[PDB]
Every structure is written in C-alpha cells, then in structure tokens.
Design a protein around this ligand. Structure first.
Ligand code: 7Q3
Lengths: 38, 153
C-alpha cells in the first residue's frame, strides 16, 4: 500500500533556474516500456 | 483529490520512502506505471484505484481516464517541476531535446534527479502539463535524459 502527499501546484515560476542541455538521440522503445540508445 | 503535484509514498521499505511523483487534475491522478505498478494509493482515509494503464507508455491513471492533453511545441522552453524525495518542489527551466525513434520524435529533458522523482510534471509557459518525467536513457557522460511522456485523452 502506498499513499500520496501533496507537493505543490502546477505553475510556471518566473524566477526559475535554467539549466540542462538539449541532446538529440536515436532511441528504441521496447514492449516493456524501456528506452534504448541506438 | 485537489489538483496539483503529489508525492507517491510508501512505508514498505525501511520507513518513509518516496517512490515517485504524480499529478492530480480534474479528479484524476496521473503518474508513471513503474512508480506504482498499478497499486492502489491512499489519499488519507480514502483510496484511489487505477483506471487506465499501459506498461509500454509507462503511464497509469487513477479514478478516471487520462486528462493531460497539452503537447510541447518543440520550440519553446519548458519547466520541470522536480519533486525529489525530502526536497521542496523546484521549477527547473530547460529546453527539451529530441528522442528520435522509428514512430516519430518526442521531447526529452536532460535533467538528472533521484529515482523517487519519477512522475514530476513538465510544464509549458501557459502552465499546462505536457508530459511526465522519469522514463529515459543514460547518455555517454553517465547523464540521464528522460522523455517527455504524455498520454492520449
Ligand atoms: N543514473 C542516472 N544518471 N540517473 C538516474 C535518474 C532516474 C530518475 C528517475 N527515473 C527512474 O528511476 C527510472 C525508472 C525506470 C523507468 C524505465 N522503465 N529508471 C531509468 O530510467 C533507468 C533507465 C535504464 C534503461 C535503459 N535501457 N536509468 C537507470 O537506471 C540509471 N540509474 C542507475 O544505474 C542507478 N540508479 C540511480 O543512480 C538512481 N537513478 C538515477 O541516478
């Protein structure tokens, strides 16, 4: 058994950190729902 | 059952453990299949039972059909409202990458977070959830790149 606890609202924050790149990858998705790098 | 982002908790480990993230919208709770594996969730004195799921999409709805229909424009920046275990929800702006597959392309965010962060929503500038975070690959640098997982309503 699991339980949920509220973590906040779904809102866009103007003063948000900007980070992370934008890679372009060829990937395969198998029947089990796992992504694979191709 | 109020709208917003919720933590998926469980006392089945050493104690309080956050297994993933979820989004409640229009009375339906949206998380990723691998987080709950369809298990029923407790919302206080009331329970929530799975309504729809697809292991391939790694998504699952509760109390109703999938309600998230917003899509990334493939152009604008978006924000990952990451919810790490024991850490306050933080908005992380970023520009999605591309997962190039045989069935088309999908957005991907190159953000690395604890395993318990699976299911944290990804927002557009308008505030609409355009997908869920937690299902991706690990790139060359040991990085983690999660796909912008979105279902059909
Ligand atoms: N390691 C990183 N740089 N970042 C991940 C972030 C993870 C965020 C939350 N997402 C998940 O938990 C999902 C759940 C399963 C969904 C797929 N059905 N897991 C992953 O996507 C699979 C994908 C591998 C399959 C590729 N074919 N990644 C891995 O396990 C890599 N982790 C390890 O090896 C050891 N674990 C850790 O360190 C803890 N977690 C990480 O650190």
């Amino acid at each position: 058994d699991m339980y949920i606890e509220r973590a906040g609202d779904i809102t866009w924050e103007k003063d948000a950190e900007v980070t992370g790149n934008s890679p372009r990858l060829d990937v395969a998705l198998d029947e089990s729902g796992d992504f694979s790098l191709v | 059952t109020t709208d917003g982002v919720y933590r998926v908790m469980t006392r089945r480990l050493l104690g309080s453990t956050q297994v993933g993230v979820g989004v409640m919208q229009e009375g339906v709770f949206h998380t990723m299949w691998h987080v709950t594996k369809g298990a029923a969730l407790r919302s206080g004195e009331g329970r929530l039972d799975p309504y729809w799921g697809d292991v391939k999409q790694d998504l699952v709805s509760y109390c109703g059909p999938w309600k998230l229909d917003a899509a990334w424009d493939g152009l604008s920046e978006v924000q990952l409202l990451a919810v790490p275990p024991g850490e306050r929800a933080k908005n992380i702006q970023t520009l999605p990458g591309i997962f190039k597959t045989k069935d088309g392309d999908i957005g991907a965010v190159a953000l690395d977070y604890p395993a318990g962060t699976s299911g944290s929503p990804i927002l557009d500038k308008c505030g609409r959830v355009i997908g869920l975070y937690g299902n991706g690959v690990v790139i060359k640098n040991g990085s983690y790149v999660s796909a912008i997982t979105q279902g059909k309503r």
